[PDB]
Amino acid sequence: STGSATTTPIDSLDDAYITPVQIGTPAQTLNLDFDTGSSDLWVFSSETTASEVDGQTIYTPSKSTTAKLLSGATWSISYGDGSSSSGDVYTDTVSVGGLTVTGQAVESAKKVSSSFTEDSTIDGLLGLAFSTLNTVSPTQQKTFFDNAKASLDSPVFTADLGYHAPGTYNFGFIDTTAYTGSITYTAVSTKQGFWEWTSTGYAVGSGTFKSTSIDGIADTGTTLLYLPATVVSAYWAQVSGAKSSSSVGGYVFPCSATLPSFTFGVGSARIVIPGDYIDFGPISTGSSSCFGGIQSSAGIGINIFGDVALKAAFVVFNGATTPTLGFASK
């Protein structure tokens, strides 16, 4: 089997991407944030504290003839940006772009933190990291991809995120028309539960390539590119007036600037992030200070190849017995 679904930016800055997901019978369609940095499929629901729902579409398990309460199961997750959610668990039928999993754990939120409430466009998350990170207790549950894997034509999914435009998540096949040149594959460590890999280096604009190993995670659920302070400083030093602002919480730059590109290495291959992808707009409405899309990972504890990086590529998440990651230009 295969599946193919369009993923759409939630706003004009590509702060996140939503993909429609069918849950239950009859189908209830929710727009979920596909997140290769976590492993829980959780949804706003009829059980979510009413004051914490503000415009989201909810899953109502009592209206699904295939929903079954997973007795005694609870979940609770905290994300790297400080947000969180928790609740109980159903199993139900879940379909993505024509690909159907029966018996998928659908984690129903009883509580969500303010950042989730405040984002009316995201109805929940669909985790695509390794199932070892799944938070369901006392019986850990599998991701949608893990459940689908054996049925797929090939045990892969691909992320093709757009810049200020829709893109695609495919399951079970590689669309050879969706990228240019070849796909370069690189080793993955699953030791921390992530799609963790090592970039071979970077360049800033038309500058020379610096060969240096950068361990980090391919994370569709993180907006920005978080890299070591040395790398980030080298980037922003090429933008007149750019500075790290403690009050704002990262590098800012004059909105009048033209940003240089940023290149990262995948083996001997190179992915070029155009400068415009690194612009996250005014820090506050009407400001002429703009927020940067490349930020320091210092104090996160891990480097994160988030959407800023991934959207410059066609990305293969290869879930073979030994997982690997592939990157192509597009």
Assign residue 228 the CATH number of its domain.
2.40.70.10
- Tell me how many degrees the CA angle 251-255-258 measures, rounded to the nearest 5: 90
- 56 shares its domain with 44: yes
- In the three-class reduction of DSSP (H, G, I as helix; E, B as strand; rest coil), residue 116 is classed as helix
Final resolution, Å: 1.3
Q: End of a domain among 119, 147, 174?
A: 174
Question: What is the domain count for the chain?
Answer: 2
Question: Which residue in 35, 92, 160, 279 is the catalytic one?
Answer: 35
- 113 shares its domain with 201: no
Catalytic-residue membership of 35: yes
- Both structure tokens of 46: 């009829």
- 17 shares its domain with 84: yes
Question: Which residue in 38, 45, 64, 199 is the catalytic one?
Answer: 199
- Both structure tokens of 58: 């909810």
The DSSP element (H or E) to which 152 belongs, if any, is: none
- Both structure tokens of 275: 């400068």
Q: How many C-alpha atoms does 198 have within 13 Å on its Cβ side?
A: 6
- 126 shares its domain with 201: no
Phi, psi of 238 (to 5 degrees): -90, 5
Ranges of beta strands (E only) in 192-296 are 196-204, 210-218, 225-227, 243-245, 250-254, 262-266, 269-273, 279-282, 289-292, 294-296
- 241 shares its domain with 291: yes
Q: How many C-beta atoms lie closer than 10 Å to residue 139's C-beta?
A: 12
- 105 shares its domain with 227: no
- 127 shares its domain with 200: no
Q: What is the dihedral of CA 254, 258, 261, 262, to 10 degrees?
A: -10
Nearest alpha carbon to residue 3 among 175, 121, 218: 175
CA–CA separation, 21 vs 141, rounded Å?
19
Catalytic-residue membership of 160: no
- Both structure tokens of 95: 């379909």
Q: End of a domain among 108, 142, 174?
A: 174
Nearest alpha carbon to residue 202 among 279, 262, 259: 262
Q: End of a domain among 174, 203, 221?
A: 174
- 182 shares its domain with 229: yes
CA–CA separation, 307 vs 226, rounded Å?
10
Burial call 244-262: b when 16+ CB within 10 Å, e when fewer: beeeeebbbbeeeeebbbb
- 163 shares its domain with 202: no
Q: Write out the residue range of the structural domain in which residue 199 sits.
A: 175-330
Check the CA dihedral 100-102-314-278 and report its sign.
Answer: positive
The 8-class DSSP code of residue 308 comes to H
- 232 shares its domain with 258: yes
- 155 shares its domain with 266: no
- 311 shares its domain with 195: yes
